[PDB]
């Protein structure tokens, strides 16, 4: 089983402040990883795939980085619409697995 | 004169410069081409030199033999041959019978050598 | 514009069998590579993958749910159905139907297969296990 | 009495083909001048007097041998380095944001086979064909394996001197106004041919030799409409061609090594490829060319049409200058009539094509890599490959079109003055002599 | 007394080995007949009067070069053809809808190197092996890359002429009933061998040279039991074979311009291929062979058995005609016994094969494309390769078996009337000759 | 007559027909094979031709030197050697002495080479 | 009066370039000496009395010709061997159960549609992390520059001798002088049809299994005072050197592609230790003392110092080997580390590392993969020469430093072909006399 | 003496051993290399043998000519050439005039054959 993890599971941020989260894997999963945004009680939405290519239509505030086993999602500037849960998914090989989730709270 | 510079001149004049012709007779795509080219040049020279060798004219530019001339090969006068016609034009007159003349001179040399062998 | 729409029973009794089914319009699942799968999220918990069905009918399931999960496709009517048995109270969650992708390559020496992350997601439906 | 006598070293020869080989002046050139034997700095060209020779450049066999050497050298230059078969992946393209270019995108394997990569490139419309609906396929991947033209070598037509093995000789005709066939009365012999540049141009002879005093026409049978009519000019017509597109170059590694080169973003405004030719100089040339044709046959009006039409590899002028192969539309030149009485350059639209064959060989294909930055080019038009259209009985005017469709005839315009013969240094003749015992 | 004397152009020779070159009589053949030098207008054989010397076909190196030359030509004709390396994908087979054929389905990459294609084809069970039982694998896929022969070039045994360079000559034995190693009479010399057909086959020589006037049995050692015994027939035993399966060929492109052919479907009921031979002719012809065999050694108990056993390539009779390769159960022929005292067609079941290793090479594997439509052919059986296993006391009985286990001996039956020697025309002898100053 | 047509005839008769024998003495797989074969032909022709050239019998079919015959090489009479002998049989009789005989003509040739120096 | 006359077969020669062919005593060798003409067991090393000849090993074409032939033979021997292109895949590695790296990766089995996981051990020199972020994913070295080609396990790299013989009409002049410095008028010269058995042993910074001087240390250099020119030293006696690969490797074979086998290192039996070479300290001590003394003659009363290379790539900064298939890389800092003056347990251990992905010709087009050799392997050879370089960018003052140079494989063979030179004989000569031809 | 064993001896001493020197002139990478080297020897030997043939010296180790010795080529006395210097240093003296000397020998020889033809 390809177990996935991500930190911090919960964090407190501020309006307009840069913030980033990291996702770690139990082994090398190449760059076949993506991230998803999920509003409270809503369908998830993809914002970056392959850990580097930003999803079309999403603003440039989000960005991806890392590879092999250490991945990370960076947000240059926060905004009020960022209230959501971010999940990291790996698609290197079956079975598919999601991350532990990361909730953001704006102070 | 230079190499082959007397081809168009008269046979008599060309006979004075026969040595110049004989002396001048002699990524890997070009390598193989040139290799076969050299082999073709060597075999071509030996082909004609071999005939000259068995006729007893080895190492001789001008050479005579015991075979008499046949009027059937050519009825032209001696003067007209050595003073008016050229080597290039003269060769066309003996395009035929050239292979036959070689047999007569080569076979005559064999029997002639045998006669000298017993005499010696 | 591609869109996913899932449906199924909102309430199911425990220890019974249930079937969910989602429809798609932007794809036909027969364009040499399109896939579709199901994911679930309990109230306030993280996401959880359930199964994936590809264009060639190949099916993949989770390690812990391989004993009670089934996936089937009806290309003639553009539908994909999931069947799950042994309904337990902890299974109550929000189920989503998302489209996946697959790619292949042949470099003479050997066949290479690559998976992709889900891009489109449905509105989702909540299933409650009550006696 | 007259006895036979054999003569050695006789200056006589006979027409016959041989195994010709290269020679050139002193690894990075497709013609492989480094591998070819060096040429003699002073070729001893001997002049002949009173000799006449029957020349027939159409029946000449050395031209076919040269055609094989050029093709053989071409394969020997492409085969060593990287091949381009992995690029047969499907292509997703769209129009460029800034007609003839398509912003193609496709999935490809990086240096490591297990990892993939998404790239973007700008391929010409001629090098892309639809497959469906914004999906396309690379042209020629349904007929032959693509071989990327190795950038470490250059396609500059460096002249190559053609020699013959010892014991043979090449007869060089030096008579002014001597057409392809006839008895040359100014024959000369030389060990090797002069510097001949193997240009790969078609429909127009570029950087070739020029006439001595007047235009000359060559054709085995001028009356036959199916036979090419090679024309040589006395004064050259300068032609300049350019591609204003900057065309930045990028590179990606397809598997281990094999650094593939592709076009990046076009810096500046996009523009089409074109060529320039002086109107007065070109128009004046046709006046004399038409006059020469009129003087030969058909003492009436002469007209030039814009080719016959068909594939771009046959009905369009092509050249290699600049490192990228061009495909120009010469319809703007052969658009005039000529009766018995009788800043400003003419523009010719052109299209670039990377996937090419240049020899009508459907079994092999080559991809030309992009050349960064604008490329400047200039050449001298010294000949033409005309084909009179004879589909109907001529009445008062004849139609001439720049046909060709054969690569052997392209180089025949340069080897018209050569013929290979084998020396026969052994002969016989009569003489009043008697060899003693 | 006497003195020495050296001669030239002497007619003497020594048994030596030299490099032979082919001269195919007058592109479309595996032996590259179009590439060999043109054959002579007529065989210029010179009869050697009063000459008698030893011959040995079991020691001459010419047969070895024939085997190696044929091997090189076979490989040379396969390198330019398409290779089936990507066809090693697993196969899912089931029984045919209409026992030796399997309806196998597999996946392959289409012309685009991104999309996969599912196809269905029929493969003979001999060339398909299981993995554990619905999944199978192609034979030789775990040994070497499968290569497909070009469908436009046939494997017909077109005759070729072997020639020696100048200075070397081949002696031709022309003694009627010539057995082999020993003295020969009526010798003749020629610069090139006659038209020899490289008829590849096992334990049966097809389209070979018939005996002069009587049955000939040859072997380097008849007393040796573990050695091959070649027999030549004076009359031709016609053999007729046919594949009644109406095969319909289909094709797909595994790569750029790389077409692959396979058995698409069969019309009608599948029927195993077979070979016919007149029972009367074979019975009478085989009886004559037994009589000559008894003359050399043993009396009565002339028994023939059904091969030895083991691999199919050696046990069965290798045969090819029209493109397809046949392997027949020759047990119906070599099943009899005789003594001094002494419908109508014998049928031999045959199993077609597609993957073959001609020349028994593990490093190379050939794949003959399927020929569409019904294929029938006929040939003349002119020679048999027999072996004996009489290691036990042959006081009462012994037997013979077909085989050979080697392809070199196949051509040995045709080159039995040739021997290459080196000519050294420099001779010496005493004579009453004195040299002068 | 023809090439090798007098090999089996009597020893003396074959000597009058040596000129014919002396005259007749001269895809990718065949290209290299044919090239090797052609080179071998020229090499074998020059090999024997070189011996006669250095022995002073350059291009001469029949030639004799100052070597006195030795009884160890042979003892047959002259009549049987020339009228009742075959070339193949004679060569096998003196095959071992062939190389030894070559040494004698070489030594005798040196004698003339030494003597011809002071004659100048 | 006098008249001109010509003489054939005259003894005279000239310096000229010519092709050379193989020749050796006597299948499974990289040099393919079995498909070569055998050597003559009677070398006609005829002595030439009173002749004086000028030899320049730095200009003969034989060394350059041998360099191309060796490279050609190497490439030719690899053309039929299996290619290792599929190995260029993601390599997940972990520390061995420091110099080795236990890696796991997916491999294409015989069935092209199936992949198999394989465990293998790769030296750290042959592995380079693809992503610096995580030292878990690794990419084989030389994978981003050329295709990997595996050496055939049947053939071996043994340096069997090969005699370089010229065609007829050419001769090889051998210098018999004891102490030929490599350039000069060799007083003792002899003519031989061709050279002796030349062993093509590939090495760097040291000459192994080579020739030895007669009784005096020979220091040959085209320009002893230059820095960019290499200095070749030849020893009078051999200095035995022996190495060992203590790792008891277990070779495993897995077939990839259509019947093409691949060899790799399996599990190590027992303890794992670094490869090393031994050399007697006492013998090496006296060797440098004699070598430094001879080298001091070219610089007067000056001290000599030895340093441990100049630094750079491992291919040129360390000694090489061809022991039974393996390719060692020994750190020679333990030898070229000392000082000498005018007046002036016993073993030196050289740490070594093994690298499989090699080139040995400084070429970026082809890559060599040496298959592992099963079981413990020992290697012993004789040191006969050293490749030195004069390290100096200031005034010579009172000391001059020297380092083991090289960086060019041509110098390796120059140390063995110095005794020969190819010349073309001109048997035609014209001279006058007092005789006139008759007419 | 062995092959090329008289190179260092004087001119006269070297002229006594020309016969041995004249007699001694005759996987895939090695095969092509040997073929290229073997044909090179044949071509090299033919290069010098052809010149000796046209000069009327075929098969003669010691051959005389009719070209007078021009003093410009060398003014040294006969004793110095035939008793003090050797061939190694003598070749370097006439290296410039070697080519011109060959031309005169050809012209003189050619004129000799023509004169013999008319005389006969
Ligand atoms: C190997 O031995 C040869 C002699 O057989 C040495 O040759 C000589 O080398 C020197 C340069 O080192 C050449 O130049 C001359 O050197 C002397 C001494 O320094 C100087 O007084 C002169 O003004 C001149 O510069 C000299 O011409 C040359 N001699 C010959 C005959 O070639 C060679 O140097 C030795 N090599 C080594 C590295 O020992
Ligand atoms: C090239 O010139 C030759 C003559 O030098 C032309 O050949 C002659 O053409 C005339 C036309 O009236 C015929 O009468 C002669 O019989 C031809 N002679 C030969 C030998 O063929 C030839 O037509 C010219 N060719 C071109 C293309 O201009
Ligand atoms: C040859 O010339 C004709 C006439 O010019 C071409 O036909 C038209 O040419 C005009 C010139 O302005 C173009 O604008 C039209 O688009 C052309 N029409 C068509 C239907 O082609 C003709 O195409 C030319 N043929 C070739 C093969 O170039
Ligand atoms: C030239 O060198 C050779 C060796 O190459 C010397 O010959 C050796 O001399 C020693 C001492 O007399 C003998 O023991 C050997 O038997 C000789 N032969 C060999 C093959 O070593 C020779 O002395 C040197 N000197 C001269 C002047 O030629
Ligand atoms: C063969 O030999 C006989 C004598 O046995 C002889 O008479 C006859 O001439 C010879 N034949 C030839 C063709 O020389």
């Amino acid at each position: 089983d390809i177990q996935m993890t991500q930190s911090p599971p919960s964090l407190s941020a501020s309006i307009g402040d840069r913030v980033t989260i990291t996702c770690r894997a139990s082994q090398g999963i190449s760059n076949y990883l993506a991230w998803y945004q999920q509003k409270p009680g809503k369908a998830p939405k993809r914002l970056v795939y392959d850990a580097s290519t930003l999803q079309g239509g999403v603003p440039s505030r989000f960005s991806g980085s890392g590879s092999g086993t250490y991945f990370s999602l960076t947000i240059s500037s926060l905004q009020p619409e960022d209230f959501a849960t971010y999940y990291c998914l790996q698609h290197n090989s079956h079975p598919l697995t999601f991350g532990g989730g990361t909730k953001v709270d704006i102070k | 004169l230079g190499f082959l510079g007397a081809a168009g001149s008269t046979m008599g004049a060309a006979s004075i410069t026969l040595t110049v012709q004989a002396r001048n007779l002699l990524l890997t795509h070009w390598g193989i081409k040139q290799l076969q080219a050299r082999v073709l040049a060597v075999e071509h020279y030996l082909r004609d030199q071999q005939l000259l060798g068995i006729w007893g004219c080895s190492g001789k530019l001008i050479c005579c033999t015991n075979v008499p001339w046949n009027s059937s090969w050519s009825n032209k006068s001696l003067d007209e041959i050595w003073n008016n016609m050229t080597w290039l034009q003269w060769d066309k007159e003996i395009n035929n019978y050239t292979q036959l003349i070689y047999r007569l001179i080569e076979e005559s040399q064999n029997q002639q050598e045998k006669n000298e062998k017993e005499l010696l | 514009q591609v869109t996913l729409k899932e449906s199924g029973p909102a309430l199911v009794k425990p220890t019974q069998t249930l079937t969910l089914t989602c429809t798609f319009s932007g794809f036909s699942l027969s364009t040499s590579g399109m896939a579709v799968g199901w994911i679930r999220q309990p109230p306030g918990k993280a996401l959880e993958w359930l199964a994936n069905i590809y264009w060639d009918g190949d099916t993949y399931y989770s390690t812990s749910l391989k004993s009670r999960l089934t996936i089937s496709k009806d290309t003639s009517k553009n539908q994909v159905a999931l069947k799950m048995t042994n309904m337990d109270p902890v299974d109550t969650a929000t189920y989503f139907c998302a489209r996946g992708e697959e790619s292949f390559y042949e470099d003479d020496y050997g066949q290479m297969e690559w998976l992709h992350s889900f891009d489109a997601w449905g509105q989702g439906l909540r299933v409650t296990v009550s006696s | 009495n007259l006895w036979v006598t054999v003569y050695y070293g006789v200056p006589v020869w006979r027409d016959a083909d041989t195994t010709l080989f290269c020679a050139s002046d002193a690894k990075h050139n497709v013609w492989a001048t480094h591998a070819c034997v060096p040429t003699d700095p002073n070729p001893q060209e001997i002049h002949l007097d009173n000799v006449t020779e029957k020349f027939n450049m159409w029946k000449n066999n050395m031209v076919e041998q040269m055609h094989e050497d050029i093709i053989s050298l071409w394969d020997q230059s492409l085969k060593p380095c990287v091949k381009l078969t992995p690029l047969c992946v499907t292509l997703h393209c769209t129009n460029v944001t800034s007609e003839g270019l398509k912003n193609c995108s496709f999935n490809m394997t990086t240096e490591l086979r297990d990892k993939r990569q998404k790239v973007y490139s700008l391929f010409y419309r001629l090098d892309i064909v639809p497959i469906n609906g914004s999906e396309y396929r690379l042209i020629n991947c349904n007929t032959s394996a693509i071989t990327q033209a190795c950038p470490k070598v250059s396609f500059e037509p460096i002249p190559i001197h053609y020699c013959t093995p010892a014991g043979f000789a090449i007869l060089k005709c030096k008579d002014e106004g001597f057409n392809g066939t006839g008895l040359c009365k100014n024959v000369s012999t030389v060990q090797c041919t002069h510097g001949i540049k193997p240009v790969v141009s078609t429909q127009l002879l570029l950087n070739g030799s020029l006439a001595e005093k007047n235009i000359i026409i060559r054709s085995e049978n001028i009356t036959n409409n199916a036979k090419i009519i090679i024309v040589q000019l006395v004064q050259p017509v300068t032609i300049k061609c350019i591609r204003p597109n900057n065309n930045t170059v990028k590179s990606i590694r397809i598997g281990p090594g094999q650094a593939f080169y592709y076009t990046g973003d076009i810096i500046g405004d996009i523009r089409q490829a074109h060529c320039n030719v002086t109107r007065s100089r070109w128009n004046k040339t046709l006046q004399e060319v038409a006059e020469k044709l009129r003087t030969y046959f058909g003492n009436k009006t002469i007209i030039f049409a814009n080719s016959s039409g068909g594939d771009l590899e046959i009905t369009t002028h092509s050249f290699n200058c600049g490192g990228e192969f061009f495909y120009c539309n010469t319809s703007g030149l052969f658009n005039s009539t000529w009766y018995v009485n009788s800043n400003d350059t003419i523009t010719l639209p052109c299209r670039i094509k990377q996937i090419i064959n240049m020899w009508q060989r459907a079994g092999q294909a080559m991809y030309a890599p992009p050349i960064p930055g604008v490329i400047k080019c200039e050449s001298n038009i010294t000949g033409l490959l005309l084909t009179r259209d004879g589909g109907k009985d001529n009445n008062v005017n004849e139609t001439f079109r720049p046909g060709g469709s054969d690569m052997r005839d392209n180089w025949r315009s340069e080897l018209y003055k050569y013929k290979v013969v084998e020396i026969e240094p052994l002969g016989v003749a009569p003489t009043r002599c008697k060899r003693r015992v």
Side-chain angles (χ1 to χ4, degrees), chain A, chain B, chain C, chain D:
Chain A
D1 195 20
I2 293 284
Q3 187 57 50
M4 203 57 28
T5 65
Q6 63 187 128
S7 301
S10 297
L11 66 99
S12 295
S14 56
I15 183 44
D17 191 8
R18 178 183 180 97
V19 72
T20 169
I21 63 180
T22 173
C23 188
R24 210 156 184 150
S26 47
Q27 56 148 74
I29 53 164
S30 179
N31 78 308
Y32 303 144
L33 165 144
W35 304 71
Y36 299 89
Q37 180 185 73
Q38 164 168 56
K39 285 288 204 286
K42 290 293 302 319
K45 274 177 72 191
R46 196 181 71 178
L47 70 161
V48 53
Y49 59 96
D50 305 338
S52 180
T53 305
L54 152 66
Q55 174 56 61
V58 172
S60 205
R61 305 189 297 95
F62 304 93
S63 277
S65 178
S67 276
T69 310
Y70 183 82
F71 304 81
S72 172
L73 204 176
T74 64
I75 323 182
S76 61
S77 180
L78 274 165
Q79 293 177 335
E81 293 177 350
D82 296 326
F83 263 120
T85 313
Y86 301 90
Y87 290 96
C88 62
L89 168 139
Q90 65 88 16
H91 50 100
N92 192 31
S93 67
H94 292 102
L96 281 290
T97 50
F98 285 90
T102 54
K103 198 197 297 294
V104 305
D105 168 31
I106 312 299
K107 295 288 98 160
Chain B
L1 266 293
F3 161 68
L4 203 56
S9 183
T10 312
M11 183 176 282
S15 77
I16 313 305
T17 176
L18 301 161
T19 183
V20 68
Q21 274 78 240
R23 189 227 301 149
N24 262 76
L25 283 173
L26 284 175
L27 192 67
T28 194
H29 178 66
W30 296 124
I32 306 303
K33 191 76 63 175
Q34 193 186 2
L35 178 61
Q36 182 157 337
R38 282 202 291 200
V39 167
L40 177 54
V42 170
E43 80 194 359
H44 194 288
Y45 165 86
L46 285 174
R47 188 202 67 207
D48 302 4
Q49 185 64 60
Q50 181 197 350
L51 263 60
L52 173 138
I54 64 171
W55 301 341
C57 307
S58 53
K60 299 188 181 181
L61 272 55
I62 315 286
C63 180
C64 292
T65 181
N66 203 44
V67 162
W69 185 260
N70 198 335
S71 203
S72 71
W73 304 331
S74 189
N75 307 293
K76 299 296 183 181
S77 181
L78 186 68
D79 168 44
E80 184 66 12
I81 293 160
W82 288 111
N83 292 331
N84 204 28
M85 257 189 237
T86 70
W87 266 123
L88 206 162
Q89 183 166 350
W90 173 245
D91 192 57
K92 268 315 310 304
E93 298 292 303
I94 318 180
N95 53 331
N96 289 296
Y97 330 115
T98 185
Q99 196 70 249
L100 165 58
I101 290 167
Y102 299 165
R103 304 293 85 82
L104 292 167
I105 61 192
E106 87 188 18
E107 70 87 18
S108 177
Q109 209 288 328
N110 192 31
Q111 60 157 282
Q112 183 164 54
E113 198 74 60
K114 192 239 67 167
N115 294 338
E116 195 150 76
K117 160 264 197 179
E118 63 178 59
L119 187 154
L120 185 62
Chain C
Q1 293 177 335
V2 61
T3 193
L4 289 306
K5 199 65 176 70
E6 47 270 58
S7 64
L11 295 95
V12 298
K13 303 297 196 185
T15 75
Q16 292 217 1
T17 294
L18 62 80
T19 51
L20 276 69
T21 312
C22 55
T23 315
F24 43 82
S25 65
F27 52 100
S28 317
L29 290 181
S30 68
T31 61
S32 81
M34 270 315 298
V36 60
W38 292 85
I39 298 96
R40 68 168 186 184
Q41 188 189 11
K45 313 304 300 318
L47 302 174
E48 185 166 275
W49 177 64
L50 296 168
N52 272 33
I53 183 154
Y54 290 79
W55 69 281
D56 55 11
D58 194 4
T59 68
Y60 295 86
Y61 311 90
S62 190
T63 316
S64 54
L65 269 51
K66 189 155 189 323
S67 61
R68 66 205 187 102
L69 256 288
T70 288
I71 196 73
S72 65
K73 63 174 185 154
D74 296 359
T75 303
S76 58
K77 58 201 70 45
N78 296 351
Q79 296 295 347
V80 57
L82 175 145
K83 169 185 316 303
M84 143 162 174
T85 65
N86 289 337
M87 272 312 325
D88 289 345
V90 175
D91 295 315
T92 181
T94 310
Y95 288 62
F96 308 105
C97 183
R99 72 193 288 278
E101 318 170 25
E102 180 177 62
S103 305
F104 313 98
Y105 193 60
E106 286 237 48
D107 59 3
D108 201 339
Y109 294 100
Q111 182 145 249
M112 204 64 95
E113 183 179 293
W114 300 310
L115 300 311
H116 299 274
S117 65
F118 309 101
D119 53 12
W121 290 67
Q123 61 176 43
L125 65 89
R126 264 281 189 81
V127 308
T128 311
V129 184
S130 175
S131 48
Chain D
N1 178 56
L2 285 177
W3 288 17
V4 74
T5 167
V6 310
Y7 282 66
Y8 185 57
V10 47
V12 65
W13 60 83
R14 284 190 291 90
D15 299 5
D17 62 309
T18 186
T19 312
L20 291 308
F21 71 105
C22 165
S24 191
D25 187 24
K27 303 200 171 184
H28 53 76
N29 185 274
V30 305
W31 311 122
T33 65
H34 303 87
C36 169
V37 78
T39 188
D40 189 289
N42 295 313
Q44 305 192 331
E45 183 186 309
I46 314 325
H47 175 64
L48 310 182
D49 66 288
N50 291 290
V51 66
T52 61
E53 190 65 87
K54 172 167 64 61
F55 279 87
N56 192 326
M57 51 66 58
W58 296 109
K59 283 288 196 186
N60 192 0
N61 193 79
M62 81 186 318
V63 64
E64 255 285 301
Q65 300 183 254
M66 202 195 68
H67 180 77
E68 179 166 275
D69 287 325
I70 294 297
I71 288 167
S72 187
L73 274 169
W74 205 254
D75 294 353
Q76 288 289 358
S77 191
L78 273 38
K79 201 185 295 183
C81 55
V82 63
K83 287 198 294 293
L84 206 62
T85 186
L87 258 171
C88 295
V89 171
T90 50
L91 309 177
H92 195 281
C93 324
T94 50
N95 313 0
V96 292
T97 59
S98 184
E99 293 177 350
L101 287 173
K102 298 293 191 202
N103 191 344
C104 288
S105 177
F106 56 91
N107 294 289
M108 184 47 103
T109 188
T110 195
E111 61 210 342
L112 284 178
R113 305 166 52 245
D114 184 41
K115 290 193 186 180
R116 63 177 164 72
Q117 51 166 348
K118 194 182 178 183
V119 305
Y120 306 90
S121 48
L122 310 184
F123 288 113
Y124 303 98
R125 181 58 182 79
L126 303 176
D127 297 313
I128 303 294
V129 61
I131 201 65
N132 84 315
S134 65
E135 288 195 317
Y136 305 83
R137 170 169 58 80
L138 203 59
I139 191 56
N140 289 284
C141 176
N142 72 305
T143 43
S144 186
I146 316 306
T147 300
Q148 197 223 280
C150 197
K152 287 272 158 268
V153 294
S154 179
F155 309 113
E156 191 155 313
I158 188 78
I160 294 169
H161 298 67
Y162 295 93
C163 298
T164 184
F168 299 74
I170 286 162
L171 302 180
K172 181 181 171 192
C173 180
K174 306 192 298 196
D175 192 26
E176 311 185 321
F178 154 82
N179 85 61
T181 305
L183 297 172
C184 185
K185 310 196 174 186
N186 193 355
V187 187
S188 167
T189 187
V190 65
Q191 211 68 200
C192 320
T193 64
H194 61 62
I196 164 163
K197 294 189 294 296
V199 290
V200 78
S201 180
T202 193
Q203 203 170 51
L204 290 179
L205 301 166
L206 275 48
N207 284 345
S209 292
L210 288 140
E212 285 79 24
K213 298 292 190 173
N214 293 299
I215 288 149
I216 52 184
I217 298 155
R218 308 201 184 81
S219 73
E220 62 179 298
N221 190 349
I222 206 171
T223 64
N224 197 306
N225 61 281
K227 297 302 190 170
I228 301 301
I229 299 170
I230 303 169
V231 179
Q232 186 161 13
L233 311 183
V234 67
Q235 184 169 94
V237 179
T238 174
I239 185 168
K240 292 179 279 274
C241 304
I242 51 169
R243 77 191 185 71
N245 302 322
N246 200 313
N247 202 335
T248 60
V249 170
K250 290 186 193 295
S251 182
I252 47 169
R253 296 183 184 278
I254 47 144
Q258 299 172 109
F260 173 52
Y261 291 79
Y262 67 103
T263 55
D265 302 84
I266 306 306
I267 287 166
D269 301 347
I270 287 163
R271 278 179 280 165
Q272 68 184 358
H274 62 266
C275 293
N276 296 47
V277 297
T278 314
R279 176 173 287 275
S280 177
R281 188 67 62 85
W282 173 256
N283 159 57
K284 172 167 161 66
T285 290
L286 293 186
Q287 189 179 256
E288 296 175 23
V289 169
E291 187 208 287
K292 204 60 52 178
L293 284 159
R294 197 193 311 110
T295 309
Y296 208 110
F297 85 102
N299 192 19
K300 300 293 170 187
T301 297
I302 275 69
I303 75 162
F304 297 112
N306 57 308
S307 87
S308 58
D311 304 21
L312 304 180
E313 314 297 327
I314 295 160
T315 200
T316 59
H317 167 41
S318 317
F319 44 97
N320 162 59
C321 77
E324 203 162 20
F325 303 111
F326 279 75
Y327 283 76
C328 292
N329 184 2
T330 195
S331 184
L333 304 191
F334 304 86
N335 181 52
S336 56
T337 176
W338 294 98
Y339 314 99
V340 186
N341 313 86
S342 176
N343 288 334
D344 49 36
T345 56
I346 290 165
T347 307
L348 294 180
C350 307
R351 289 183 291 263
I352 305 303
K353 196 170 188 270
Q354 291 180 339
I355 295 286
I356 65 103
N357 309 102
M358 68 180 21
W359 312 117
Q360 294 88 17
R361 283 199 305 179
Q364 296 294 114
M366 171 255 278
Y367 170 84
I371 301 288
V374 181
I375 48 163
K376 295 294 295 296
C377 158
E378 175 162 17
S379 55
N380 297 346
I381 284 159
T382 60
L384 312 79
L385 268 75
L386 267 57
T387 300
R388 74 171 287 267
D389 186 9
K392 185 72 180 186
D393 181 31
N394 69 304
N395 40 85
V396 188
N397 64 63
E398 280 73 10
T399 59
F400 293 85
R401 284 176 145 87
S405 89
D406 201 325
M407 201 45 158
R408 279 86 58 75
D409 301 329
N410 163 38
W411 297 313
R412 269 194 168 98
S413 77
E414 200 65 41
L415 293 168
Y416 71 98
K417 64 174 69 166
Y418 295 115
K419 179 166 78 166
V420 53
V421 303
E422 65 184 15
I423 308 303
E424 185 128 312
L426 186 135
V428 298
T431 295
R432 47 170 59 240
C433 67
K434 308 181 285 188
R435 178 141 64 83
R436 302 156 175 147
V437 295

